[PDB]
Structures are given as C-alpha cells and as structure tokens.
Amino acid sequence: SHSVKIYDTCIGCTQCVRACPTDVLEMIPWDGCKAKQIASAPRTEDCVGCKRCESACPTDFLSVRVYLWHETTRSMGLAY
C-alpha cells in the first residue's frame, strides 16, 4: 500500500517506530551514524499513512518519509 522510505540522514533515535502504531517500522543495525542503527519499513502493507513516524523524525527535513499510494482496507484503517 503506502511506500515508506528511510533515507540515510537517520540518526537512529528510534522515535519513528516507537511512535508508529501499526508495526510498520523496525530498527536494524547500520554503519552510517554514531548510534549504529537505522530504521527500515518491511511491513508497509500495514501502513495507514498517519505520518506519526515523520512527525517524530528530528532531521533537517526528514529521514523517514511516507508516500501516499494505493489505499487498501488496512491502509484505510477499516474495521469493516
């Protein structure tokens, strides 16, 4: 559904995923920062698009980035 992307400006503060209410994100090891971790987005099918991840990305503009795309029943957040 939605296309979440994490760019290489991430500092690995784990706010993107601790804010994400649908388990879309997960921190993985990395070698590009002092924290040695970066966020990944495997479960984009569970992405609703609420952008709580990028409302918590403390960078110049953003490192995590949500692109609104094909909306399915779970990205639209329907219990019916």
Which positions lie near ligand SF4, rule CB under 6 A? 4, 6, 10-16, 19-20, 22, 24-25, 39, 47-53, 56-57, 59, 63-64, 66
Please tell me whether residue 28 binds another protein under the rule CB under 8 A: no
Collapsed DSSP state (helix, strand, coil) of residue 32:
coil
Q: Would the annotation count 33 as a binding residue?
A: no
Q: Would the annotation count 47 as a binding residue?
A: yes
Distance (Å, rounded) from C-alpha 47 to C-alpha 77?
9
56 Cβ contact list (under 8 Å, min separation 6): 15, 16, 18, 19
Q: Would the annotation count 57 as a binding residue?
A: yes
Amino acid symbol at 23: D
Residue closer to ligand SF4 (CB basis): 39 or 80: 39
Distance (Å, rounded) from C-alpha 75 to C-alpha 31?
32
Contact residues: another protein, CB under 8 A: 8-9, 11, 31-34, 50-52, 54-61, 65-73, 76, 78-80
